[PDB]
From Swiss-Prot, chain A:
Subcellular location: Nucleus
Additional comment: Present with 13400 molecules/cell in log phase SD medium. Early fractionation of eukaryotic MCM proteins yielded a variety of dimeric, trimeric and tetrameric complexes with unclear biological significance. Specifically a MCM467 subcomplex is shown to have in vitro helicase activity which is inhibited by the MCM2 subunit. The MCM2-7 hexamer is the proposed physiological active complex.
Modified residues (Phosphothreonine): 3
Annotated organism of origin: Saccharomyces cerevisiae (strain ATCC 204508 / S288c) (Baker's yeast)
Protein's UniProt name: DNA replication licensing factor MCM6
Subunit structure: Component of the MCM2-7 complex. The complex forms a toroidal hexameric ring with the proposed subunit order MCM2-MCM6-MCM4-MCM7-MCM3-MCM5; loaded onto DNA, forms a head-head double hexamer. Interacts with MCM10.
Family affiliation: Belongs to the MCM family.
Residues of the full protein shown: 764 to 969 of 1017
Record's function text: Acts as a component of the MCM2-7 complex (MCM complex) which is the putative replicative helicase essential for 'once per cell cycle' DNA replication initiation and elongation in eukaryotic cells. The active ATPase sites in the MCM2-7 ring are formed through the interaction surfaces of two neighboring subunits such that a critical structure of a conserved arginine finger motif is provided in trans relative to the ATP-binding site of the Walker A box of the adjacent subunit. The six ATPase active sites, however, are likely to contribute differentially to the complex helicase activity.
Swiss-Prot record, chain B:
Family in the record: Belongs to the MCM family.
Residues that span the membrane, as ranges: none
Entire protein: shown range: 677 to 864 of 868
Descriptive protein name: DNA replication licensing factor MCM2
Entry function: Acts as a component of the MCM2-7 complex (MCM complex) which is the putative replicative helicase essential for 'once per cell cycle' DNA replication initiation and elongation in eukaryotic cells. The active ATPase sites in the MCM2-7 ring are formed through the interaction surfaces of two neighboring subunits such that a critical structure of a conserved arginine finger motif is provided in trans relative to the ATP-binding site of the Walker A box of the adjacent subunit.
Subunit-structure text: Component of the MCM2-7 complex. The complex forms a toroidal hexameric ring with the proposed subunit order MCM2-MCM6-MCM4-MCM7-MCM3-MCM5; loaded onto DNA, forms a head-head double hexamer.
Note: Present with 1690 molecules/cell in log phase SD medium.
Subcellular locations according to the entry: Nucleus
Length: 140, 139, 96
């Protein structure tokens, strides 16, 4: 049984786990689901069973943690922010599944194709178009 | 189904805080009413009290419906209908039961309208963001 | 008892009491409380009773609490029945 307040640490560990795994979504996610937070518990207690230690250690927690991590990696293989997110998203995917390069216009092309779903009004389209264009013009 | 509860959508710093504290709290174990008195409370109120609205000042609701209806027709389909009006009233008087109020009050209405209206909002497509801006007066 | 129901904030307190171990949401529990707590039937002489209940569609998401919440309701409510989907956990939803 872990009464120990080093459990607090576990939170940030849970917290450390999902953040880097939020973007991209093209990573191994999952989510990472809260059920995984819930999983880290039974894992911890498991390692406690292993080592006979009671109230465990933050270290054993880190072991269960890294374990889940490799189990994840094996699965891997505002305006400007949204556009910069597009840049990082496209590159991060294409670097892992390709070199990335090619026609810069295409990036705007498929970008408009994706954001067209979020467009509430024509002003949102026009803004997104002129922003992505502004970023590319600034970038070059 | 009158009330639709739709969960979303992604994690976050604080959300992970808030959650993890709760889970950890649970596993470590080994303001709200005591469960027993609430589970008595409910039965008690359902048996005894039958709240009722009074025709005089509640005409407002009608207006509200209109205020919701037409402006919602511009975007999204349908879903709104007089049914979805009736659910307002009924839910409101449920809250009137929690108040043990014997009659319907404006507070209850506030609560209800927030419930059903946010329910309707959250069902719609992402264009419902455009909806949100008129929810303010309804808020 | 009566003296407790008099404060206005009792509502919120109750909702907060409604699903302790989930940590839940304020909304999704609010619906639960509302439908679980009641409504008025209410028969119009002599014809139609409308409906006195609130039907909650809780639309979940894998990993969300969507199961556990309703399980609470089986413990708390007076008469509460768990039919699962089918297949079945008795009872099976169809009178026969």
């Amino acid at each position: 049984i872990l009464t120990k307040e080093a459990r607090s640490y576990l939170v940030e560990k849970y917290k450390e786990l999902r953040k880097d795994d939020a973007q991209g979504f093209s990573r191994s996610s999952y989510r990472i689901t809260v059920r995984q937070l819930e999983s880290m518990i039974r894992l911890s207690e498991a390692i406690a069973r292993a080592n006979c230690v009671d109230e465990i250690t933050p270290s054993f927690i880190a072991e269960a943690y890294d374990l889940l991590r490799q189990s994840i990696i094996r699965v891997d293989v505002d305006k400007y922010v949204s556009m910069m997110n597009m840049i990082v998203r496209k590159i991060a995917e294409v670097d892992r599944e390709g070199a990335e390069e090619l026609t810069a216009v295409d990036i705007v092309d498929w970008y408009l194709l994706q954001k067209e779903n979020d467009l509430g009004s024509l002003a949102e389209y026009w803004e997104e178009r002129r922003l992505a264009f502004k970023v590319i013009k600034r970038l070059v | 189904f009158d009330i639709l509860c739709v969960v979303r959508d992604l994690v976050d710093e604080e959300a992970d805080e808030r959650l993890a504290t709760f889970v950890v709290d649970s596993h470590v174990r080994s303001s709200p009413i005591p469960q027993e008195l609430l589970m008595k409370y409910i039965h008690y109120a359902r048996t005894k009290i039958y709240p009722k609205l009074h025709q005089m000042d509640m005409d407002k609701v009608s207006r509200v419906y209109a205020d919701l209806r037409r402006e919602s027709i511009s975007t999204g389909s349908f879903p709104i209908t007089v049914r979805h009006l009736e659910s307002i009233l009924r839910i409101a008087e449920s809250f009137a039961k929690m108040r043990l109020s014997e009659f319907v009050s404006s507070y209850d209405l506030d609560r209800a309208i927030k419930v059903v209206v946010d329910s309707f909002v959250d069902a719609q497509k992402v264009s419902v963001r455009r909806q949100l801006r008129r929810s303010f007066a309804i808020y | 008892f009566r003296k407790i129901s008099r404060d206005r904030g009792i509502i919120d307190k109750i909702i907060s009491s409604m699903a302790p171990s989930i940590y839940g949401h304020r909304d999704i529990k609010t619906a639960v409380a509302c439908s679980l707590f009641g409504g008025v039937p209410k028969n119009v002489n002599g014809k139609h009773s409308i409906r006195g209940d609130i039907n909650v569609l809780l639309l979940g998401d894998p990993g969300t609490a969507k199961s556990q919440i309703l399980k609470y309701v089986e413990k708390t409510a007076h008469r509460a029945v768990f039919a699962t989907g089918q297949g079945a956990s008795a009872v099976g939803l169809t009178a026969s």
